[PDB]
């Protein structure tokens, strides 16, 4: 139901879920294709942090805000905690 | 840089593309950049400003194909007894490589052949492939692909492989015409095979009338069929 | 699976094969030489593209992926006036 | 092939693919309309199997798909309203070309039967939206982009 | 409620459905005794298509008429 990349530093990964689904299941993706343990990152809405007892889509993140063509900007910070760095993208014209 | 329309000169471009493209058609190993910046150099060129030299490009993929497939119908030649599997092995470096130089040349296609009495490059491929290599070089295959199939007839078990290719490559040279896509291998290697094998079992037929008696005959002529 | 994809200025971007084939030359890309034998990678070297097209390029990948063959409104996807020009281009690049 | 390939276009700028797809053009009425209806998808159909450039257009801008769904009766025959658009869509009919005159095809249907047949026949592409939003905001593209970009901006 | 809709051949579909029902569940018999599955038809009630529950009362209450229905697939 749910339709939101996943932007950490360089990489920005664009997922689809429900609103149902949990913020675990997210970390067990961001595991499988960018290999940090669950406790080495943490979700963002935009700058508030979350958890992950909390379901996707009980922090904000509705269908109506979390569309496939206006993706919500989920910010992901991995630990070496690290902060929450994310560089802006390139200057359009 | 970027998608803008630039003025860049199609010498050694071409010259660095035909490595890349070389090494492409014999399965070679090539980088993924290398491979990834193929699509932003093809279409560059495409669009190169101020005049697109696709039909450049073209020419120039045209007689960079015929080339290399007279080289290879050259040294196929040279095995002459053998060619058979000299066509198969090289067949195999060609036909993926063919297809892998197709989808190299998807920006091509979608733009410049399609919309301008053209062939695409994977058509092309193909048809260089039969007009040099095939249909030039055709007696000596068909005449030595019926003694080979002969033998296995008879009593061989030769190169299964070589034979199933080799036959497939003579249909998967005209999958690209819509209208009868058969219609090469329909003539080239079916009408003279047709023929050889009605004569083999004529006079097969003709040896087991005498034989055997009319009882055997049943099993003889159901075990060459299931055969 | 997912593939991966090379901006022009850093800026990684993964997006999931099924979801990336739809547009032309990323599916040639995928379709190279070498069997690929790692299957969780796969990136490609976008150096001429900026970042923001291809993060608009991944936004309009997964509105084609929701909105593929429905009876629904089908939605307007939202382009910004500056990149519009970049993303003519960019799908002039990636065909469909 | 060869009466289409020596490029046949009318006064209107029509082709024989736009008369084809054309319920105004006139049929003999002495022992011909009898048999010959117009617009005709089969013929229409033979014309995308001798390869018609279905993607023509004429002094107003409007192209077979422009034409044919201006069609009045989408009752009386449905079927040659229905197969001529799958038959038009067959081999490059770009459904979100605009015509001189800036009237999408879908505009120009003034017919529920036949606009949802266009939007099933219809498939969403990058490069028409980002076209239709760069001409509706009017960024210079001259001189910037490939000429057959420039050639789908005037598309659209 | 008997249905006589036409088809690309002028074929027969047996909706049998009051105009009460709702298109839906109405299609599903037409294309029943024509071959097509349920969610596969779009059915054009002379002038517009059916969408979600999409009751028969909408559509002027016709009963059975001419509805030329749409083949198109991927439509499920």
Redesign the interface.
């Known amino acids: 139901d749910v339709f939101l990349m996943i932007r950490r530093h360089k990489t920005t990964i664009f997922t689809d879920a429900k609103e149902s689904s949990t913020v675990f299941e997210l970390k067990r993706i961001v595991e499988g294709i960018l290999k940090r343990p669950p406790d080495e990152q943490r979700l963002y809405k935009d700058d508030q942090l979350l958890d992950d007892g909390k379901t996707l889509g009980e922090c904000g993140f509705t269908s109506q805000t979390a569309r496939p063509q206006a993706p919500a900007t989920v910010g992901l910070a991995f630990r070496a905690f690290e902060a929450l760095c994310i560089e802006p993208f390139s200057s359009p014209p | 840089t970027s998608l803008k329309p630039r003025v860049v000169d199609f010498d050694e471009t071409w010259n660095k593309l035909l490595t890349t493209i070389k090494a492409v058609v014999m399965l070679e190993y090539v980088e993924r950049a290398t491979w990834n910046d193929r699509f932003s150099d093809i279409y560059a060129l495409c669009v190169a400003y101020p005049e697109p030299l696709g039909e450049r490009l073209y020419t120039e993929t045209k007689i960079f194909l015929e080339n290399h497939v007279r080289h290879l119908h050259k040294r196929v030649l040279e095995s002459e007894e053998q060619v058979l599997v000299m066509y198969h092995r090289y067949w195999e470096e060609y036909s993926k490589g063919a297809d892998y130089m197709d989808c190299l040349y998807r920006y091509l296609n979608t733009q410049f052949i399609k919309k301008n009495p053209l062939m695409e490059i994977g058509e092309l491929a193909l048809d260089m492939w039969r007009k040099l290599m095939v249909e030039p070089l055709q007696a000596i295959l068909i005449r030595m692909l019926l003694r080979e199939i002969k033998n296995d007839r008879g009593g061989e078990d030769p190169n299964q492989k070589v034979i199933h290719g080799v036959i497939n490559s003579f249909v998967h040279v005209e999958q690209y015409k819509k209208k009868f896509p058969l219609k090469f291998y329909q003539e080239i290697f079916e009408s003279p095979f047709l023929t050889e094998t009605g004569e083999y079992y004529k006079q097969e037929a003709s040896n087991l009338l005498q034989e055997s008696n009319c009882s055997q005959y049943m099993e003889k002529v159901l075990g060459r069929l299931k055969d | 699976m997912y593939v991966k994809l090379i901006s022009s200025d850093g800026h990684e971007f993964i997006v999931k094969r099924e979801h990336a084939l739809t547009s032309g030359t990323i599916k040639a890309m995928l379709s190279g030489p070498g069997q690929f034998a790692e299957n969780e990678t796969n990136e490609v070297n976008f150096r001429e593209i900026p970042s923001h097209v291809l993060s608009k390029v991944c936004m309009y990948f997964t509105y084609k992926v929701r909105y593929t ?1 429905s ?1 629904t409104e089908i939605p307007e996807f939202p382009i910004a006036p500056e990149i519009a020009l970049e993303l003519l281009m960019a799908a002039n690049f990636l065909d469909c | 092939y060869n009466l289409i390939h020596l490029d046949p276009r009318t006064r209107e700028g029509f082709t024989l693919l736009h008369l084809a797809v054309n319920s105004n053009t006139p049929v003999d009425d002495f022992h011909t309309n009898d048999v010959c209806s117009f617009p005709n998808a089969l013929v229409t159909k033979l014309l995308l199997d001798c390869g018609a450039e279905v993607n023509a257009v004429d002094n107003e801008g409007n192209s077979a798909l422009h034409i044919i769904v201006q069609y009045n009766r ?2 009386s025959d ?2 040659t309203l ?1 197969s001529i658009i799958i038959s038009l869509v067959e081999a490059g009919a770009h459904t979100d070309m605009t015509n001189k005159q800036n009237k999408t095809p879908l505009d120009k249907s003034t ?3 036949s606009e ?2 266009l939007k ?1 026949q219809m498939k969403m592409s990058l490069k028409c939206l980002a076209a239709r939003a760069v001409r509706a905001n009017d960024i210079n593209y001259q001189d910037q982009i490939p000429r057959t970009l420039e050639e789908f901006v005037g598309f659209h | 409620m008997l249905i006589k809709v ?1 088809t ?1 051949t002028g074929k027969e579909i047996e909706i049998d459905i009051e105009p009460t029902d709702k298109v839906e569940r109405i299609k599903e018999r037409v294309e029943e005794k024509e071959g097509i599955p349920p969610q596969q038809q ?1 059915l ?1 009630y ?4 059916m ?1 979600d529950e999409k009751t028969a009362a909408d559509y002027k209450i016709l009963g059975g008429s ?1 509805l ?1 229905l ?1 083949l ?1 697939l ?2 499920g």
């Open positions: 063959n009876s | 989408p009752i449905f079927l229905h017919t529920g039967v949802i047949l099933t | 036409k690309l779009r054009i002379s002038g517009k298509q969408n001419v030329h749409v198109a991927r439509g």
